[PDB]
Amino acid sequence: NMDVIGERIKRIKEEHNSTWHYDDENPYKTWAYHGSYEVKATGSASSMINGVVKLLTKPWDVVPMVTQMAMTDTTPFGQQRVFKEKVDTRTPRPLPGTRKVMEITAEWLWRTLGRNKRPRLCTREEFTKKVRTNAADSAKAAVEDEEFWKLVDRERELHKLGKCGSCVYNMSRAIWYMWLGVRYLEFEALGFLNEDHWFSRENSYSGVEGEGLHKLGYILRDISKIPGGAMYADDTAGWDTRITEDDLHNEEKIIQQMDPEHRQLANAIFKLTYQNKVVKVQRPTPTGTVMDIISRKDQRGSGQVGTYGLNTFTNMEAQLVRQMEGEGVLTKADLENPHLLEKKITQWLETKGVERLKRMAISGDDCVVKPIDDRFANALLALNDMGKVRKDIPQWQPSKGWHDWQQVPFCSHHFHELIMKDGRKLVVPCRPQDELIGRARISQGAGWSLRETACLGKAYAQMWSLMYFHRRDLRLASNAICSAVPVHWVPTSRTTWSIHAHHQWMTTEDMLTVWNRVWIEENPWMEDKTPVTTWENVPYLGKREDQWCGSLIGLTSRATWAQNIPTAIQQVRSLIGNEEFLDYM
Numbered sequence: 001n002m003d004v005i006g007e008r009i010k011r012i013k014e015e016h017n018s019t020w021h022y023d024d025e026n027p028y029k030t031w032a033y034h035g036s037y038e039v040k041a042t043g044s045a046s047s048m049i050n051g052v053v054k055l056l057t058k059p060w061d062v063v064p065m066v067t068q069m070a071m072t073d074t075t076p077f078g079q080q081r082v083f084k085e086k087v088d089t090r091t092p093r094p095l096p097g098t099r100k101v102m103e104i105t106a107e108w109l110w111r112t113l114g115r116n117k118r119p120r121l122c123t124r125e126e127f128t129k130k131v132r133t134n135a136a137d138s139a140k141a142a143v144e145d146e147e148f149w150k151l152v153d154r155e156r157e158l159h160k161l162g163k164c165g166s167c168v169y170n171m172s173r174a175i176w177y178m179w180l181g182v183r184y185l186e187f188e189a190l191g192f193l194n195e196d197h198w199f200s201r202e203n204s205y206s207g208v209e210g211e212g213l214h215k216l217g218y219i220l221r222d223i224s225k226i227p228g229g230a231m232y233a234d235d236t237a238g239w240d241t242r243i244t245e246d247d248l249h250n251e252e253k254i255i256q257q258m259d260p261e262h263r264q265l266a267n268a269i270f271k272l273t274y275q276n277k278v279v280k281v282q283r284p285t286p287t288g289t290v291m292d293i294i295s296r297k298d299q300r301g302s303g304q305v306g307t308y309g310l311n312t313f314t315n316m317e318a319q320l321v322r323q324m325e326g327e328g329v330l331t332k333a334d335l336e337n338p339h340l341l342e343k344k345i346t347q348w349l350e351t352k353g354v355e356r357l358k359r360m361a362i363s364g365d366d367c368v369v370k371p372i373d374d375r376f377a378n379a380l381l382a383l384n385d386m387g388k389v390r391k392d393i394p395q396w397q398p399s400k401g402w403h404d405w406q407q408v409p410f411c412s413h414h415f416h417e418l419i420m421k422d423g424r425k426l427v428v429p430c431r432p433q434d435e436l437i438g439r440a441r442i443s444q445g446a447g448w449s450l451r452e453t454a455c456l457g458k459a460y461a462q463m464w465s466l467m468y469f470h471r472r473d474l475r476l477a478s479n480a481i482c483s484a485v486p487v488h489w490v491p492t493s494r495t496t497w498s499i500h501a502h503h504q505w506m507t508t509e510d511m512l513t514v515w516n517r518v519w520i521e522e523n524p525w526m527e528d529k530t531p532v533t534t535w536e537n538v539p540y541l542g543k544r545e546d547q548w549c550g551s552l553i554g555l556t557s558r559a560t561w562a563q564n565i566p567t568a569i570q571q572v573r574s575l576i577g578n579e580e581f582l583d584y585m
């Protein structure tokens with residue numbers, strides 16, 4: 001194993017020769033520990049509060065879920081405890097028959113995904129445009145520096161020789177150039193999966209990449225029209241820690257479809273930074289803070305370019321295998337059998353495979369499956385054996401599914417069908433309101449002026465008018481924030497990092513205009529393109545559903561808040577100063 005990771009460790013070792021030591025009190029049990037050196041502690045024990053949102057959401061100052069979100073520890077203490085709880089595990093190797101089925105499904109799935117698309121290398125100018133159309137960070141400074149690209153070419157030459165000198169996963173401008181350089185190289189070799197939308201619904205059948213939150217509900221509603229059993233949405237306990245060496249080897253079959261110059265670089269990414277990895281993690285000691293240098297041959301690194309796509313691929317594969325088990329194609333004896341018959345797996349994939357993928361909505365580790373019948377609830381042999389053990393349920397307890405798509409959890413949301421005053425139906429996204437308010441009340445980082453804080457508040461208020469308008473409290477709060485923040489101020493920073501976020505709320509354009517564009521114009525499931533001219537024609541959940549999902553409607557504190565909200569608006573206005581403001585109440 002030292003033949004792949006050696007050069008990276010030797011460099012860190014040499015660079016930190018003053019403080020390099022082998023700490024014998026290290027907590028690594030499944031990760032290989034190479035040594036430590038001294039660092040300055042990074043992180044915060046709590047999270048910075050957005051005072052603009054907090055002032056306009058008074059009834060939530062006392063809500064437990066709202067307070068909990070305002071915490072979250074990124075210090076070496078918090079960092080060590082998250083590592084201990086999840087990341088320091090070992091997944092038992094899947095049985096020989098399970099490995100055989102997985103391998104056959106992986107080959108077939110890769111041929112299907114690349115039936116119209118051809119893999120290709122991504123470029124410096126693509127990476128440059130992405131960094132630029134995100135920054136408006138020291139990443140835009142690096143991208144503009146020629147010496148950064150020279151380090152990239154040096155590293156790539158080592159990768160062409162099957163060597164790695166500086167691609168280290170992190171749990172001076174030199175270390176940062178090595179980090180951004182590692183991400184460019186990964187973007188170069190595997191970025192095509194994201195950039196050329198290999199996991200779009202049209203290309204993957206089960207995928208939902210590029211759809212966006214406002215469309216996931218409609219996709220769930222279309223899956224419900226297919227004959228079969230209930231809709232299952234089982235959560236995996238730490239999906240990324242459950243990615244095995246057999247998973248990684250199946251994921252790399254994609255290199256067979258690549259041009260030779262591309263294959264070489266993708267192989268270097270797999271073999272050197274996925275199937276082997278050098279990791280840096282901060283640890284508090286009595287003497288101070290240290291950086292630990294660890295390594296391992298499996299698991300997925302969350303902060304990686306290929307993570308979403310390769311997780312979507314492996315989950316699509318794992319769910320097809322569970323469907324085969326559910327249908328009787330895969331038995332307990334088959335899973336234990338190394339000399340298992342490939343023919344029936346092939347026959348099922350070639351005759352039923354695409355139809356079976358159409359029954360699913362898969363986004364990373366997130367899945368919804370509508371099997372042909374309910375035998376699927378008890379088809380747990382392959383799932384547990386593959387290592388995709390379900391979260392908070394005994395291993396052999398049958399899965400509980402839903403006979404109503406509106407009750408199905410997917411991507412931290414559930415989805416409602418609303419009837420508009422004009423008779424038209426909308427499918428809207430919903431999540432517990434405490435999470436939405438809790439998230440909006442968090443400002444990202446320290447040393448942020450009122451302008452930047454208010455603008456982030458406007459971005460959250462505008463995300464709510466576009467996605468969560470059907471929530472009474474959120475439409476009021478959103479109007480209140482847009483009344484307190486100057487009209488010509490542009491929403492800054494991001495409200496979310498989700499791949500399902502398209503950020504149409506990042507504008508000074510009228511929100512009712514953006515609403516019509518998303519929900520009417522661009523909406524393929526809205527046949528009648530008649531615009532909605534007033535927000536009074538933009539619907540709400542029924543009071544009871546609103547209450548079921550976290551609303552404070554019907555509470556005295558909420559009535560007191562709604563009554564006194566112009567007073568709070570004026571206090572934010574008077575503190576921001578003399579600018580142009582608009583009354584939305």
Ligand SMILES: COc1cccc(S(=O)(=O)NC(=O)c2cc(-c3ccc(C#CCO)s3)c(OC)cc2OC)c1
Binds near residue numbers: 212411413497500503
């Ligand atoms: C990923 O892991 C996290 C962990 C903690 C925090 C966060 S976060 O605050 O940065 N984001 C979310 O909580 C969050 C947001 C969304 C969306 C919101 C609006 C959207 C739209 C549109 C139309 O284009 S999409 C979403 O949609 C599926 C899924 C999300 O989470 C699973 C993320």
Ligand SMILES: [Zn+2]
Binds near residue numbers: 163165166167272
């Ligand atoms: Zn490298």
Ligand SMILES: [Zn+2]
Binds near residue numbers: 414430431545
């Ligand atoms: Zn809801």
